[PDB]
């Protein structure tokens, strides 16, 4: 019985993803987020062990929601006549990374390193679970301000991970790679690495590097802030024009800029508390 298990609080936001409300699980007072998705707005459908027909978003969340990780966990879901309702983890207190960068500007490299490392671990977890997020960006990352933990949200543009070409894309354009702009084709891993270079630039410069198609395919990155030579190197490597010139996750995590990461608790004590 959905409406009696959850006290519905205020609207947290709405858009392409649906409508998300703050909530409290009535039994144990667990903070949750209650996401409503209209059936007309779901193009991508899948099914579970049961062979019951659900939004792809529910398939992907279940695949990643087992064990602890830097992914928002799906706690429950419900079908209504015109909608699905998803019950998600809600960190408290929380700020999305987009708002955090708006308020604080360009992040110190030590904080960007801690955040970028956690996003890499979260994206490895997705890939290891057979899930491609396809919309990695500051707006889809929550900061747990007391634990210093990042959580990935919004799998509504995601797909099962495959080794063959993708010819569909409904993620954020300006985090989309040049091969999509030019050819309407991409491979999952190398396109994820592009979106990670956009995100790292966003953290160390305070905004995304490209606005127009011509900048995305142009192959020049201009630094608007003071950024270390090792950080510029990693970013320009992630943003290689040719997908096969981009680093693997292993090569990113072994990059000299990535060494000596803070633990989440240290990150919260030094930068967040």
Residue numbers in the entry: 33 to 305
From the paper:
The PIM (proviral integration site for Moloney murine leukemia virus) family of protein kinases (PKs) includes three constitutively active serine/threonine kinases (PIM-1, PIM-2, and PIM-3) that regulate key biological processes, including cell survival, proliferation, differentiation, and apoptosis. As a basophilic kinase of the CAMK family, PIM kinases recognize basic residues, in particular arginines at positions -3 and -5 of the phosphorylation site, which are required for high affinity interaction. All crystal structures contained one protein molecule in the asymmetric unit, in which the adenosine analogue moiety of the inhibitors was positioned in the ATP-binding site of PIM-1 and the peptide mimetic moiety bound on the surface of the substrate protein site.
The peptide mimetic moiety of ARC-1411 was resolved in the complex with PIM-1 to a larger extent compared to the previously reported complex with PKAcα. Due to the insertion of a proline residue in the hinge of PIM kinases, the pyrimidine moiety did not engage in additional hinge backbone hydrogen bonds. The GRL itself assumed a folded conformation, which is often observed in PIM-1 inhibitor complexes where the phenylalanine (F49) is positioned at the tip of the GRL and flipped into the ATP binding pocket. The following arginine in ARC-1411 formed polar interactions with D239 that were not present in the substrate complex, most likely increasing the affinity of ARC-1411. However, similar to the substrate residue R-4, the next arginine moiety in ARC-1411 pointed toward the solvent, but the following arginine mimicked again the substrate arginine in position -5, which is required for high-affinity substrate interactions. At this position, the arginine side chains formed an intricate network of polar interactions with residues located in αD (T134), αF (D234), and D170.
